[PDB]
Design an enzyme around this catalytic site. Structure first.
Site, mmCIF file in Angstrom:
data_model
loop_
_atom_site.group_PDB
_atom_site.id
_atom_site.type_symbol
_atom_site.label_atom_id
_atom_site.label_comp_id
_atom_site.label_asym_id
_atom_site.label_seq_id
_atom_site.Cartn_x
_atom_site.Cartn_y
_atom_site.Cartn_z
ATOM 1 N N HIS A 9 34.935 23.171 31.756
ATOM 2 C CA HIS A 9 34.082 22.043 31.404
ATOM 3 C C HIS A 9 34.607 20.723 31.950
ATOM 4 O O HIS A 9 33.911 19.707 31.841
ATOM 5 C CB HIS A 9 33.898 21.965 29.884
ATOM 6 N N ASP A 44 36.060 29.245 29.513
ATOM 7 C CA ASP A 44 36.222 27.829 29.833
ATOM 8 C C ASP A 44 37.533 27.602 30.581
ATOM 9 O O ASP A 44 38.313 26.703 30.265
ATOM 10 C CB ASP A 44 36.158 26.972 28.567
ATOM 11 N N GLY A 54 40.046 13.910 26.256
ATOM 12 C CA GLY A 54 40.683 13.870 27.555
ATOM 13 C C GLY A 54 41.965 14.660 27.668
ATOM 14 O O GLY A 54 42.659 14.540 28.685
ATOM 15 N N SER A 109 41.985 18.147 27.056
ATOM 16 C CA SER A 109 41.681 19.529 27.395
ATOM 17 C C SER A 109 42.443 19.932 28.650
ATOM 18 O O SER A 109 42.631 19.127 29.568
ATOM 19 C CB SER A 109 40.177 19.714 27.604
HETATM 20 C C1 LIG Z 1 29.702 23.569 31.489
HETATM 21 O O1 LIG Z 1 30.469 24.757 31.475
HETATM 22 C C2 LIG Z 1 31.182 24.992 30.281
HETATM 23 C C3 LIG Z 1 31.828 26.362 29.992
HETATM 24 C C4 LIG Z 1 32.604 26.605 28.684
HETATM 25 C C5 LIG Z 1 32.739 25.452 27.642
HETATM 26 N N1 LIG Z 1 33.481 25.657 26.372
HETATM 27 C C6 LIG Z 1 33.586 24.546 25.424
HETATM 28 C C7 LIG Z 1 34.351 24.738 24.098
HETATM 29 C C8 LIG Z 1 32.918 23.182 25.757
HETATM 30 O O2 LIG Z 1 32.994 22.103 24.851
HETATM 31 C C9 LIG Z 1 32.710 20.803 25.412
HETATM 32 C C10 LIG Z 1 33.722 20.277 26.040
HETATM 33 C C11 LIG Z 1 34.818 20.343 24.886
HETATM 34 C C12 LIG Z 1 35.821 19.367 24.711
HETATM 35 O O3 LIG Z 1 35.498 18.278 24.372
HETATM 36 N N2 LIG Z 1 37.275 19.676 24.822
HETATM 37 C C13 LIG Z 1 38.251 18.602 24.505
HETATM 38 C C14 LIG Z 1 38.377 17.492 25.582
HETATM 39 O O4 LIG Z 1 39.159 16.603 25.453
HETATM 40 N N3 LIG Z 1 37.550 17.540 26.784
HETATM 41 S S1 LIG Z 1 37.776 16.282 27.930
HETATM 42 O O5 LIG Z 1 37.767 14.947 27.314
HETATM 43 O O6 LIG Z 1 39.125 16.353 28.502
HETATM 44 C C15 LIG Z 1 36.502 16.470 29.225
HETATM 45 C C16 LIG Z 1 35.015 16.517 28.821
HETATM 46 C C17 LIG Z 1 36.909 17.359 30.405
HETATM 47 C C18 LIG Z 1 36.836 15.836 30.575
HETATM 48 C C19 LIG Z 1 39.683 18.816 23.994
HETATM 49 C C20 LIG Z 1 38.658 18.068 23.135
HETATM 50 C C21 LIG Z 1 38.988 16.705 22.479
HETATM 51 C C22 LIG Z 1 38.038 16.054 21.776
HETATM 52 C C23 LIG Z 1 36.600 16.622 21.566
HETATM 53 C C24 LIG Z 1 35.543 15.478 21.622
HETATM 54 C C25 LIG Z 1 34.205 15.901 20.941
HETATM 55 C C26 LIG Z 1 33.658 17.225 21.556
HETATM 56 C C27 LIG Z 1 33.770 18.344 20.475
HETATM 57 C C28 LIG Z 1 33.521 19.737 21.059
HETATM 58 N N4 LIG Z 1 33.817 20.694 20.010
HETATM 59 C C29 LIG Z 1 33.518 22.132 20.163
HETATM 60 O O7 LIG Z 1 32.831 22.525 21.049
HETATM 61 O O8 LIG Z 1 34.064 23.039 19.216
HETATM 62 C C30 LIG Z 1 33.562 24.366 19.309
HETATM 63 C C31 LIG Z 1 34.421 25.277 18.389
HETATM 64 C C32 LIG Z 1 35.919 25.497 18.705
HETATM 65 C C33 LIG Z 1 33.689 26.456 17.738
HETATM 66 C C34 LIG Z 1 34.057 25.225 16.902
HETATM 67 C C35 LIG Z 1 34.459 20.014 22.230
HETATM 68 O O9 LIG Z 1 35.618 20.196 22.057
HETATM 69 N N5 LIG Z 1 33.941 20.077 23.605
HETATM 70 C C36 LIG Z 1 32.697 19.893 24.043
HETATM 71 N N6 LIG Z 1 32.193 22.988 26.994
HETATM 72 C C37 LIG Z 1 32.098 24.114 27.940
HETATM 73 C C38 LIG Z 1 31.318 23.865 29.255
#
Ligand SMILES: COc1ccc2nc(C)c(O[C@@H]3C[C@H]4C(=O)N[C@]5(C(=O)NS(=O)(=O)C6(C)CC6)C[C@H]5/C=C\CCCCC[C@H](NC(=O)OCC5(C)CC5)C(=O)N4C3)nc2c1
Ligand SMILES: [Zn+2]
EC number: 3.4.22.-
Length: 197
Positions: free
Chosen positions: A77, A101, A157, A159
């Site tokens: 992602h 992911d 940011g 991840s």
């Molecule tokens: C398109 O192809 C694909 C394939 C597989 C895939 N798989 C994922 C799980 C996913 O999720 C999205 C990105 C992810 C993060 O934001 N990830 C970081 C992050 O920081 N990203 S980042 O800022 O670096 C960035 C965007 C890269 C630059 C680490 C968090 C920190 C804060 C989150 C902010 C709010 C968001 C809360 C949300 N929650 C959640 O989905 O929980 C679910 C669960 C575990 C069941 C309950 C969440 O985490 N995400 C949203 N997209 C995809 C997309």
């Protein structure tokens, strides 16, 4: 011409690192915005790479990448199917699994890999792009609870960054976060068992 105007998507670019070699973790920037954008279009990165945790950026997003088992891993992602800039030109991914992911490139010359944890520990430590070390209590195979919930902005940011055991092995890489009223309560990570080709 329509097709003659079709541009190509940029490469992921290493713009810094999280240094974990001493007794403090700290973030280092190795490339500014302008240099990042230029390097993304060319795919040629002559900067010397060091360490295990890299700060990476696309044209539009910034996140982390962790070297384990000789592969630089990060989240789909963030990186999509993009190549990564390197000294010899853009490099195609070694590994791509949207269902986890997870993507991976061959690890840079000069980088080092973390060791996969075999401890079965449930006391984990998440390293953020700001070099914060956040205690996390492991829940099952791929989840964890924050010991002290912080604002979700503290995790955005990060991840692709590592969750480490007490001894500093890699347990997994940060994938997603769960919040309740804007406060981060738990995280999901890709277990290190999957970070191997
Ligand atoms: C398109 O192809 C694909 C394939 C597989 C895939 N798989 C994922 C799980 C996913 O999720 C999205 C990105 C992810 C993060 O934001 N990830 C970081 C992050 O920081 N990203 S980042 O800022 O670096 C960035 C965007 C890269 C630059 C680490 C968090 C920190 C804060 C989150 C902010 C709010 C968001 C809360 C949300 N929650 C959640 O989905 O929980 C679910 C669960 C575990 C069941 C309950 C969440 O985490 N995400 C949203 N997209 C995809 C997309
Ligand atoms: Zn361990």
């Amino acid at each position: 011409s329509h097709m003659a105007s079709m541009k190509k998507k940029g490469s992921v670019v290493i713009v810094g690192r999280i240094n974990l070699s001493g007794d403090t973790a700290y973030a280092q920037q190795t490339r500014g915005e302008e240099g990042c954008q230029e390097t993304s279009q060319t795919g040629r990165d002559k900067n010397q790479v060091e360490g295990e945790v890299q700060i990476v950026s696309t044209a539009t997003q910034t996140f982390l990448a962790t070297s384990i088992n000789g592969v630089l891993w990060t989240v789909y992602h963030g990186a999509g199917t993009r190549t990564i800039a390197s000294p010899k030109g853009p490099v195609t991914q070694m590994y791509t699994n949207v269902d986890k992911d997870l993507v991976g490139w061959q690890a840079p010359q000069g980088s080092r890999s973390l060791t996969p944890c075999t401890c079965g520990s449930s006391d984990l430590y998440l390293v953020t792009r700001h070099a914060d070390v956040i205690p996390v209590r492991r829940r099952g195979d791929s989840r964890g609870s924050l010991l002290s919930p912080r604002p979700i902005s503290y995790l955005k940011g990060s991840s692709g960054g590592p969750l480490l055991c007490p001894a500093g092995h890699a347990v997994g890489i940060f994938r997603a976060a769960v919040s309740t009223r804007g406060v981060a309560k738990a995280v999901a990570f890709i277990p290190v068992e999957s970070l191997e080709t």
